[PDB]
């Protein structure tokens, strides 16, 4: 029935708050934060603006080693009680002729929501 | 628990399943099925490699205006409703594919919610 519980008003709200740390962390580079919001499994993934790392720990092991943007636009889209995908689109003044997308999506683990997947790029439009 | 049901086998073979379809459709331009396969809501969004799109309308509508190799595939479901599948690919060859997905099981079947395409060295 997942498709009749379509952004269900706690969870799009909770959703929405991790989803908020986690761009605080990215822009701050708080990699603590970062890392703890992506799940810890070797099927996470995360397809980069410039690689493909699969599992948490090729994926931690990235952040040690990697800043401010403008989102312009967000779909946060949540389907029963847990699971979300969150979407952006961001501009940085540095490359001011490419648009950026972030692609997630999101489960409740148990111990919170986290990232099991995503896909960040920069195109022209 | 939801982590304690990844990957269930028979959850995964049906997202396979649909995976191979979408895969098939792509390589021959059934558009038909292509838009079979997004889920039917304005939530649905594809960015593409060239274009961002909101809603399936829009998707649908690009679709009517508009081979490669695989190689490296990992579809992962989450309980029996909720799965998301990434791909590698390449054509173009200093350039490497990405494309990712999260399907959805709704009432008319599987669907895909959520879709990101792009291109890297």
Redo the contacts between chains.
């Keep these: ?3 009749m519980q ?1 952004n269900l008003p706690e969870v799009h709200a909770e959703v929405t708050a991790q989803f908020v740390r986690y761009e605080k962390a990215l822009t701050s580079n708080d990699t603590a934060v970062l890392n703890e919001l992506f799940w810890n ?1 070797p ?1 996470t ?1 995360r ?1 980069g ?4 790392l ?1 599992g948490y720990e090729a994926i931690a092991g990235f952040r040690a080693t990697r800043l401010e943007r403008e989102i312009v636009r967000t ?1 946060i ?1 949540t ?2 009680h ?2 979300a ?1 969150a ?1 952006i ?1 961001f501009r940085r003044l540095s490359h001011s002729q490419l ?1 950026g ?1 972030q ?1 997630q ?1 999101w ?4 111990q919170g929501w986290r990232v ?2 995503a ?1 960040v ?1 920069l ?1 022209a ?1």
Excluded: K, P, W
Excluded at 49 to 52: D, G, K, R, V, Y
Excluded at 107 to 110: E, F, P
């Design positions: 029935m997942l498709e379509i499994s099927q993934l397809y603006a410039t690689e493909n699969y779909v889209t389907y029963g847990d699971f995908t979407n689109e648009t997308r692609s999506t489960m409740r683990t148990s099991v997947a896909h790029s195109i439009l």
